[PDB]
Design an enzyme around this catalytic site. Sequence first.
Site, PDB file in Angstrom:
ATOM      1  N   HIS A 108       7.541   0.970 -13.411  1.00 56.76           N
ATOM      2  CA  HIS A 108       6.332   0.407 -13.973  1.00 56.76           C
ATOM      3  C   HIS A 108       6.353  -1.121 -13.777  1.00 56.76           C
TER       4      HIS A 108
ATOM      5  N   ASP B 201      12.927  10.612 -15.072  1.00 59.11           N
ATOM      6  CA  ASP B 201      11.556  10.160 -15.218  1.00 59.11           C
ATOM      7  C   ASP B 201      11.196   9.293 -14.012  1.00 59.11           C
TER       8      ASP B 201
ATOM      9  N   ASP C 148     -14.704  36.084 -13.681  1.00 57.74           N
ATOM     10  CA  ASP C 148     -15.636  36.420 -14.721  1.00 57.74           C
ATOM     11  C   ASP C 148     -16.011  37.893 -14.673  1.00 57.74           C
TER      12      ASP C 148
ATOM     13  N   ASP D  43       9.921  14.412 -13.104  1.00 69.16           N
ATOM     14  CA  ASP D  43       8.643  14.834 -13.697  1.00 69.16           C
ATOM     15  C   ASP D  43       7.447  14.403 -12.796  1.00 69.16           C
TER      16      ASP D  43
ATOM     17  N   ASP E  15     -12.061  29.041 -16.654  1.00 70.53           N
ATOM     18  CA  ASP E  15     -10.720  29.415 -17.150  1.00 70.53           C
ATOM     19  C   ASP E  15      -9.754  29.777 -15.998  1.00 70.53           C
TER      20      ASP E  15
ATOM     21  N   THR F 141       4.274  12.083 -17.859  1.00 65.51           N
ATOM     22  CA  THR F 141       5.553  12.561 -18.350  1.00 65.51           C
ATOM     23  C   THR F 141       5.408  13.828 -19.197  1.00 65.51           C
TER      24      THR F 141
ATOM     25  N   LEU G 237     -10.174  32.224 -13.998  1.00 64.48           N
ATOM     26  CA  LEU G 237     -10.037  33.658 -13.959  1.00 64.48           C
ATOM     27  C   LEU G 237     -11.394  34.312 -13.669  1.00 64.48           C
TER      28      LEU G 237
ATOM     29  N   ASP H 137     -16.782  31.731 -11.973  1.00 62.85           N
ATOM     30  CA  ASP H 137     -15.971  31.223 -13.049  1.00 62.85           C
ATOM     31  C   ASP H 137     -16.868  30.332 -13.928  1.00 62.85           C
TER      32      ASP H 137
HETATM   33  C1  LIG Z   1      -1.758  30.630 -17.047  1.00 62.68           C
HETATM   34  O1  LIG Z   1      -0.906  31.486 -17.856  1.00 62.68           O
HETATM   35  C2  LIG Z   1      -1.382  31.635 -19.177  1.00 62.68           C
HETATM   36  C3  LIG Z   1      -0.369  32.413 -20.049  1.00 62.68           C
HETATM   37  O2  LIG Z   1      -0.349  33.779 -19.531  1.00 62.68           O
HETATM   38  C4  LIG Z   1      -2.779  32.311 -19.200  1.00 62.68           C
HETATM   39  O3  LIG Z   1      -3.284  32.049 -20.554  1.00 62.68           O
HETATM   40  C5  LIG Z   1      -3.470  33.269 -21.316  1.00 62.68           C
HETATM   41  O4  LIG Z   1      -4.716  33.867 -20.985  1.00 62.68           O
HETATM   42  C6  LIG Z   1      -5.201  35.047 -21.662  1.00 62.68           C
HETATM   43  C7  LIG Z   1      -6.723  35.338 -21.306  1.00 62.68           C
HETATM   44  O5  LIG Z   1      -7.582  34.141 -21.312  1.00 62.68           O
HETATM   45  C8  LIG Z   1      -5.068  34.780 -23.184  1.00 62.68           C
HETATM   46  O6  LIG Z   1      -5.353  35.976 -23.950  1.00 62.68           O
HETATM   47  C9  LIG Z   1      -6.328  35.712 -25.046  1.00 62.68           C
HETATM   48  O7  LIG Z   1      -5.697  35.103 -26.220  1.00 62.68           O
HETATM   49  C10 LIG Z   1      -5.862  35.589 -27.586  1.00 62.68           C
HETATM   50  C11 LIG Z   1      -4.477  35.599 -28.287  1.00 62.68           C
HETATM   51  O8  LIG Z   1      -4.201  34.188 -28.307  1.00 62.68           O
HETATM   52  C12 LIG Z   1      -3.115  33.605 -29.096  1.00 62.68           C
HETATM   53  O9  LIG Z   1      -1.796  34.182 -28.917  1.00 62.68           O
HETATM   54  C13 LIG Z   1      -0.973  33.859 -27.759  1.00 62.68           C
HETATM   55  C14 LIG Z   1       0.404  34.658 -27.786  1.00 62.68           C
HETATM   56  O10 LIG Z   1       1.542  34.207 -28.601  1.00 62.68           O
HETATM   57  C15 LIG Z   1      -0.917  32.301 -27.641  1.00 62.68           C
HETATM   58  O11 LIG Z   1      -0.250  31.809 -26.464  1.00 62.68           O
HETATM   59  C16 LIG Z   1      -2.304  31.621 -27.635  1.00 62.68           C
HETATM   60  O12 LIG Z   1      -2.083  30.178 -27.485  1.00 62.68           O
HETATM   61  C17 LIG Z   1      -3.256  29.374 -27.159  1.00 62.68           C
HETATM   62  O13 LIG Z   1      -3.966  28.831 -28.282  1.00 62.68           O
HETATM   63  C18 LIG Z   1      -3.248  27.826 -29.045  1.00 62.68           C
HETATM   64  C19 LIG Z   1      -4.329  27.218 -29.901  1.00 62.68           C
HETATM   65  O14 LIG Z   1      -4.810  28.363 -30.560  1.00 62.68           O
HETATM   66  C20 LIG Z   1      -2.518  26.686 -28.286  1.00 62.68           C
HETATM   67  O15 LIG Z   1      -1.425  26.190 -29.092  1.00 62.68           O
HETATM   68  C21 LIG Z   1      -2.017  27.069 -26.876  1.00 62.68           C
HETATM   69  O16 LIG Z   1      -1.942  25.858 -26.040  1.00 62.68           O
HETATM   70  C22 LIG Z   1      -2.920  28.169 -26.250  1.00 62.68           C
HETATM   71  O17 LIG Z   1      -4.169  27.510 -25.933  1.00 62.68           O
HETATM   72  C23 LIG Z   1      -4.721  27.955 -24.685  1.00 62.68           C
HETATM   73  O18 LIG Z   1      -5.238  29.307 -24.773  1.00 62.68           O
HETATM   74  C24 LIG Z   1      -6.503  29.537 -25.463  1.00 62.68           C
HETATM   75  C25 LIG Z   1      -6.913  31.038 -25.389  1.00 62.68           C
HETATM   76  O19 LIG Z   1      -5.909  31.896 -25.985  1.00 62.68           O
HETATM   77  C26 LIG Z   1      -7.582  28.571 -24.885  1.00 62.68           C
HETATM   78  O20 LIG Z   1      -8.844  28.693 -25.558  1.00 62.68           O
HETATM   79  C27 LIG Z   1      -7.104  27.093 -24.914  1.00 62.68           C
HETATM   80  O21 LIG Z   1      -7.967  26.200 -24.211  1.00 62.68           O
HETATM   81  C28 LIG Z   1      -5.734  26.886 -24.263  1.00 62.68           C
HETATM   82  O22 LIG Z   1      -5.974  26.882 -22.858  1.00 62.68           O
HETATM   83  C29 LIG Z   1      -3.197  32.078 -28.835  1.00 62.68           C
HETATM   84  O23 LIG Z   1      -2.961  31.345 -30.057  1.00 62.68           O
HETATM   85  C30 LIG Z   1      -6.653  36.907 -27.741  1.00 62.68           C
HETATM   86  O24 LIG Z   1      -7.080  36.817 -29.096  1.00 62.68           O
HETATM   87  C31 LIG Z   1      -7.822  37.070 -26.722  1.00 62.68           C
HETATM   88  O25 LIG Z   1      -8.587  38.303 -26.952  1.00 62.68           O
HETATM   89  C32 LIG Z   1     -10.059  38.369 -26.737  1.00 62.68           C
HETATM   90  O26 LIG Z   1     -10.474  38.727 -25.397  1.00 62.68           O
HETATM   91  C33 LIG Z   1     -10.016  40.077 -25.070  1.00 62.68           C
HETATM   92  C34 LIG Z   1     -10.405  40.427 -23.632  1.00 62.68           C
HETATM   93  O27 LIG Z   1      -9.682  41.619 -23.292  1.00 62.68           O
HETATM   94  C35 LIG Z   1     -10.448  41.259 -26.000  1.00 62.68           C
HETATM   95  O28 LIG Z   1      -9.384  42.223 -26.203  1.00 62.68           O
HETATM   96  C36 LIG Z   1     -10.944  40.852 -27.383  1.00 62.68           C
HETATM   97  O29 LIG Z   1     -12.351  41.233 -27.454  1.00 62.68           O
HETATM   98  C37 LIG Z   1     -10.766  39.356 -27.748  1.00 62.68           C
HETATM   99  O30 LIG Z   1     -12.148  39.016 -28.029  1.00 62.68           O
HETATM  100  C38 LIG Z   1     -12.391  38.659 -29.420  1.00 62.68           C
HETATM  101  O31 LIG Z   1     -12.213  37.243 -29.588  1.00 62.68           O
HETATM  102  C39 LIG Z   1     -13.062  36.453 -28.722  1.00 62.68           C
HETATM  103  C40 LIG Z   1     -12.600  34.997 -28.739  1.00 62.68           C
HETATM  104  O32 LIG Z   1     -12.080  34.700 -30.045  1.00 62.68           O
HETATM  105  C41 LIG Z   1     -14.502  36.703 -29.204  1.00 62.68           C
HETATM  106  O33 LIG Z   1     -15.517  36.009 -28.468  1.00 62.68           O
HETATM  107  C42 LIG Z   1     -14.812  38.199 -29.084  1.00 62.68           C
HETATM  108  O34 LIG Z   1     -16.246  38.343 -29.241  1.00 62.68           O
HETATM  109  C43 LIG Z   1     -13.794  39.022 -29.952  1.00 62.68           C
HETATM  110  O35 LIG Z   1     -13.746  38.785 -31.385  1.00 62.68           O
HETATM  111  C44 LIG Z   1      -7.171  36.977 -25.308  1.00 62.68           C
HETATM  112  O36 LIG Z   1      -6.222  38.015 -25.015  1.00 62.68           O
HETATM  113  C45 LIG Z   1      -3.742  34.103 -23.634  1.00 62.68           C
HETATM  114  O37 LIG Z   1      -3.857  33.594 -24.985  1.00 62.68           O
HETATM  115  C46 LIG Z   1      -3.423  32.871 -22.790  1.00 62.68           C
HETATM  116  N1  LIG Z   1      -2.141  32.284 -23.118  1.00 62.68           N
HETATM  117  C47 LIG Z   1      -1.888  30.966 -23.075  1.00 62.68           C
HETATM  118  C48 LIG Z   1      -0.462  30.517 -23.488  1.00 62.68           C
HETATM  119  O38 LIG Z   1      -2.711  30.106 -22.745  1.00 62.68           O
HETATM  120  C49 LIG Z   1      -3.707  31.662 -18.193  1.00 62.68           C
HETATM  121  O39 LIG Z   1      -4.859  32.521 -18.089  1.00 62.68           O
HETATM  122  C50 LIG Z   1      -3.017  31.386 -16.835  1.00 62.68           C
HETATM  123  N2  LIG Z   1      -3.931  30.628 -15.986  1.00 62.68           N
HETATM  124  C51 LIG Z   1      -4.368  31.070 -14.795  1.00 62.68           C
HETATM  125  C52 LIG Z   1      -5.338  30.137 -14.090  1.00 62.68           C
HETATM  126  O40 LIG Z   1      -3.954  32.130 -14.336  1.00 62.68           O
HETATM  127  C1  YEC Z   2       9.751   8.681 -25.573  1.00 62.61           C
HETATM  128  N1  YEC Z   2      10.777   9.744 -25.403  1.00 62.61           N
HETATM  129  C2  YEC Z   2      10.644  10.695 -24.528  1.00 62.61           C
HETATM  130  O1  YEC Z   2       9.629  10.613 -23.894  1.00 62.61           O
HETATM  131  C3  YEC Z   2      11.727  11.751 -24.370  1.00 62.61           C
HETATM  132  C4  YEC Z   2      12.957  11.976 -25.032  1.00 62.61           C
HETATM  133  N2  YEC Z   2      13.609  13.111 -24.558  1.00 62.61           N
HETATM  134  C5  YEC Z   2      12.762  13.565 -23.555  1.00 62.61           C
HETATM  135  C6  YEC Z   2      13.015  14.755 -22.657  1.00 62.61           C
HETATM  136  O2  YEC Z   2      12.089  15.832 -22.976  1.00 62.61           O
HETATM  137  C7  YEC Z   2      12.115  16.931 -22.269  1.00 62.61           C
HETATM  138  C8  YEC Z   2      13.052  17.104 -21.343  1.00 62.61           C
HETATM  139  C9  YEC Z   2      13.023  18.228 -20.617  1.00 62.61           C
HETATM  140 CL1  YEC Z   2      14.249  18.213 -19.531  1.00 62.61          CL
HETATM  141  C10 YEC Z   2      12.098  19.231 -20.763  1.00 62.61           C
HETATM  142  C11 YEC Z   2      12.078  20.463 -19.974  1.00 62.61           C
HETATM  143  N3  YEC Z   2      12.076  21.493 -19.373  1.00 62.61           N
HETATM  144  C12 YEC Z   2      11.218  19.042 -21.699  1.00 62.61           C
HETATM  145  C13 YEC Z   2      11.159  17.914 -22.464  1.00 62.61           C
HETATM  146  C14 YEC Z   2      10.155  17.798 -23.519  1.00 62.61           C
HETATM  147  C15 YEC Z   2       9.341  16.467 -23.390  1.00 62.61           C
HETATM  148  C16 YEC Z   2       9.161  18.930 -23.534  1.00 62.61           C
HETATM  149  C17 YEC Z   2      10.979  17.872 -24.908  1.00 62.61           C
HETATM  150  N4  YEC Z   2      11.636  12.779 -23.418  1.00 62.61           N
HETATM  151  C18 YEC Z   2      10.576  13.006 -22.415  1.00 62.61           C
HETATM  152 CA    CA Z   3       7.492  10.258 -16.698  1.00 61.21          CA
HETATM  153 CA    CA Z   4     -13.723  32.880 -15.773  1.00 60.46          CA
HETATM  154 ZN    ZN Z   5       5.777   6.163 -16.434  1.00 60.94          ZN
END
Ligand SMILES: *[C@@H]1O[C@H](CO)[C@@H](O[C@@H]2O[C@H](CO)[C@@H](O[C@@H]3O[C@H](CO[C@H]4O[C@H](CO)[C@@H](O)[C@H](O[C@H]5O[C@H](CO)[C@@H](O)[C@H](O)[C@@H]5O[C@H]5O[C@H](CO)[C@@H](O)[C@H](O)[C@@H]5O)[C@@H]4O)[C@@H](O)[C@H](O[C@H]4O[C@H](CO)[C@@H](O)[C@H](O)[C@@H]4O[C@H]4O[C@H](CO)[C@@H](O)[C@H](O)[C@@H]4O)[C@@H]3O)[C@H](O)[C@H]2NC(C)=O)[C@H](O)[C@H]1NC(C)=O
Ligand code: YEC
Ligand code: CA
Ligand code: CA
Ligand code: ZN
Length: 804
Positions: free
Chosen positions: A264, A120, A690, A307, A686, A158, A688, A682
């Site tokens: 810190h 850290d 548009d 980190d 996102d 962190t 990506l 964009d």
């Molecule tokens: C960095 O890398 C990442 C990972 O590759 C890229 O992110 C991906 O981008 C894809 C496109 O934007 C995206 O795909 C969409 O997701 C839907 C499925 O989503 C769920 O399942 C996955 C898989 O296990 C999961 O990872 C997702 O997790 C997100 O959401 C939860 C909360 O729900 C969080 O815990 C997690 O942090 C994560 O949040 C992030 O992602 C969401 C979007 O998914 C954001 O809104 C958040 O802010 C946050 O950033 C999901 O739980 C899928 O359903 C989508 O499908 C729609 O669009 C397609 C277009 O082809 C189409 O087929 C359909 O029409 C569909 O549309 C319908 O739904 C629309 C919206 O509901 C609606 O308006 C329409 O009218 C239709 O009904 C889509 O495929 C993928 O999920 C994410 N993955 C992650 C991990 O983020 C990212 O792009 C990269 N960045 C760069 C800059 O390159």
């Molecule tokens: C107040 N206590 C803490 O803050 C604490 C206790 N143990 C950890 C280490 O956690 C990590 C370590 C590693 Cl090496 C990676 C990776 N890759 C990810 C994590 C997370 C945070 C995702 C579990 N932290 C930060």
């Molecule tokens: Ca830290």
């Molecule tokens: Ca976009």
């Molecule tokens: Zn710190």
Amino acid sequence: TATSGSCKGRCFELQEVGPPDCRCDNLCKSYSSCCHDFDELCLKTARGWECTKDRCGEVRNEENACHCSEDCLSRGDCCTNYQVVCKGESHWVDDDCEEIKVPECPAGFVRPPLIIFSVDGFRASYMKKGSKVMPNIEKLRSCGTHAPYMRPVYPTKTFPNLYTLATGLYPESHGIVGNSMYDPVFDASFHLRGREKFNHRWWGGQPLWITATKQGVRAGTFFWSVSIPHERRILTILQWLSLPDNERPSVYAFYSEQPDFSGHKYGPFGPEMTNPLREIDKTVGQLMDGLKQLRLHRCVNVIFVGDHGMEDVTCDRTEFLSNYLTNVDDITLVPGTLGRIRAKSINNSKYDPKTIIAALTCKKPDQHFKPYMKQHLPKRLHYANNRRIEDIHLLVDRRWHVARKPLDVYKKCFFQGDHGFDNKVNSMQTVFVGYGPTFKYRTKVPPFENIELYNVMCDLLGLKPAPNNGTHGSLNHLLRTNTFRPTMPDEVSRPNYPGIMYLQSEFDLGCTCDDKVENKLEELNKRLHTKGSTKERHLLYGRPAVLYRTSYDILYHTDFESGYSEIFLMPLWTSYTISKQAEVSSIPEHLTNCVRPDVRVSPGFSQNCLAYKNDKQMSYGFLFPPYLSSSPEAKYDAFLVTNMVPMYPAFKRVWAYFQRVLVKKYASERNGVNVISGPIFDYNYDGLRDTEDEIKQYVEGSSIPVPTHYYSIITSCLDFTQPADKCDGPLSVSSFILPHRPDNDESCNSSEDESKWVEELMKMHTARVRDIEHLTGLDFYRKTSRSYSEILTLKTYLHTYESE
Ligand SMILES: *[C@@H]1O[C@H](CO)[C@@H](O[C@@H]2O[C@H](CO)[C@@H](O[C@@H]3O[C@H](CO[C@H]4O[C@H](CO)[C@@H](O)[C@H](O[C@H]5O[C@H](CO)[C@@H](O)[C@H](O)[C@@H]5O[C@H]5O[C@H](CO)[C@@H](O)[C@H](O)[C@@H]5O)[C@@H]4O)[C@@H](O)[C@H](O[C@H]4O[C@H](CO)[C@@H](O)[C@H](O)[C@@H]4O[C@H]4O[C@H](CO)[C@@H](O)[C@H](O)[C@@H]4O)[C@@H]3O)[C@H](O)[C@H]2NC(C)=O)[C@H](O)[C@H]1NC(C)=O
Ligand SMILES: CNC(=O)c1cnc(COc2cc(Cl)c(C#N)cc2C(C)(C)C)n1C
Ligand SMILES: [Ca+2]
Ligand SMILES: [Ca+2]
Ligand SMILES: [Zn+2]
Ligand SMILES: [K+]
Ligand code: NA
């Protein structure tokens, strides 16, 4: 919890048992759920952590923290220094460094284990400035593979960075967007303290331990409870490593709270920091001596990684929003090294973001923070596409804090160090060392971003990475073996190559040009230019590939080549080469308002001048600049309607200066440059490209879409003794994604001459080629003499404009 069961024989068990049984895994502490005897059985301390001469061959006493008895190596629980004290062996750090060409592993080992040793607040310059007190670390560094530094993600806190390390995702995508958050959809608050941060709904993506487990690879814990001492974490890892083949994890993590904790208090280079560095080093020594006892020191891959860094920050360098706003109690500030602002009350429709921003904009001559709407932040930060990220953001100058009101800073000076600033800041950079059979021997690699490591850790473990923001292949140069063999994405849309198909009079675009001025020698000559005779000069790396379905034309010209979109009515990209010798001219007076129909492209797929006339906000610029025309005659090409793009007057100040002064400056400094420029859309921020149905703004009364940004990629020869257009070896690139804004409010000095603010804006909006790829659906550098892995490295490069 029924804490009436026992940890007898289960200390640091790997799969946590399900309630209401009591727990003996190393999270039990953090859930108030450990069995009664957890401390007594699992956290022994008797006799400390080192064997001494007098304990050698002792009788196993099971109360001891660790053992010096003859049977300890076989039980997997000797003190780490046992062989040194009791068997005349050398400490790992005293041994010469010897290339590890192949994994040298005990029988039963299916793959070299991976140990992630995360520290850290380990600032990059510690590697040099603390070198004299970190012998174990310095050996790992000089004998393994190392970068001069590793770039964290923003914010440089962190949890956002360790979860980025584990997922390969930007915080916007994984969900951990700061060290505190509010989530409106849950209605809920995440904080460092307390229990909420343990609910799994915060944590998106797929971390390495889950990737491993799903694919049949076992993992140790990644989270360590704060009350388990370092020595016990190391011994626990080394014990797990003695498990039988079917039970033994392949990936492990160790985490140190130091040097952050001290940083810190004392600042990054406070005299008090020498001891924490010594202590981390000693821990590293314990792990390596432990591995060597178990004959694993030429088998395991070790990653030593930080980190984030640490900067000098004090209470007196605090900016107070109460000095800017009257209404300071109508808001909530997430404060410190960044700012996030939302409304105190969601029931108050007399909250206006616009007025809050204006009240924070350029209000004091030396203001140490800058307000942004999140979609206007530099695209390199990738910090917008999450509901947990407030619409208003303050980017705080390094060395400063922001707070709501003074009472928040004294009714909470304590601290002399902090972090969380912009991830380009030198003081926030952290470390990477890779040591082991799979890493290279005595190799330095260039700085890279921590988002790349997940792919590599997956490679190291034979796992298929879940989808992430790394560019798989860009770090292959770190590895001896286990390289990922990437290939270029297939081109989805093939271009058209139109010839002359329209007569001038078929266009009614409301454009004019003063160009009625009519020779056979240079009639074949210009035809050659429109068939692409100079294209080898202006298109050095091949045409970019379009990775989505669309309709576009390649247009050739004497001075530039373009890929013209029939759907968005402007180029997707415009490529041109400016040699060191090239001359800047001006736009002649008679050609000031000149726009010319392109006889290769239909009226119905062209812009028109009447829309710009009618749109009182919107003006126009050009992608290939008229100023750099090779000849008076070639200049007419630059005024084609197919080279025109919509530009706010305020933005034309930036763009004109870039094209009139900076391109030529760069060509002179870099011995020619190849420039590729174009629009970006964009609207949903996102990161990506548009689709057309996502565009929220058009040039009034038209189908001409308004870009959110303009990019340029500027490439030359890394060996600047060769001209850009005749380069035999590696390339050098810098790029930017400038926000297309109707004001220059972002630049506090914008009333001055462009020579005093434009370049500074462009630096702030520096970008990777990969960032432009995501935003455009284009794939660049398709035809070079370089290996694809090297090009991937180039596409992830960011030019930071920090000093050394
Ligand atoms: C960095 O890398 C990442 C990972 O590759 C890229 O992110 C991906 O981008 C894809 C496109 O934007 C995206 O795909 C969409 O997701 C839907 C499925 O989503 C769920 O399942 C996955 C898989 O296990 C999961 O990872 C997702 O997790 C997100 O959401 C939860 C909360 O729900 C969080 O815990 C997690 O942090 C994560 O949040 C992030 O992602 C969401 C979007 O998914 C954001 O809104 C958040 O802010 C946050 O950033 C999901 O739980 C899928 O359903 C989508 O499908 C729609 O669009 C397609 C277009 O082809 C189409 O087929 C359909 O029409 C569909 O549309 C319908 O739904 C629309 C919206 O509901 C609606 O308006 C329409 O009218 C239709 O009904 C889509 O495929 C993928 O999920 C994410 N993955 C992650 C991990 O983020 C990212 O792009 C990269 N960045 C760069 C800059 O390159
Ligand atoms: C107040 N206590 C803490 O803050 C604490 C206790 N143990 C950890 C280490 O956690 C990590 C370590 C590693 Cl090496 C990676 C990776 N890759 C990810 C994590 C997370 C945070 C995702 C579990 N932290 C930060
Ligand atoms: Ca830290
Ligand atoms: Ca976009
Ligand atoms: Zn710190
Ligand atoms: K106009
Ligand atoms: Na301004």
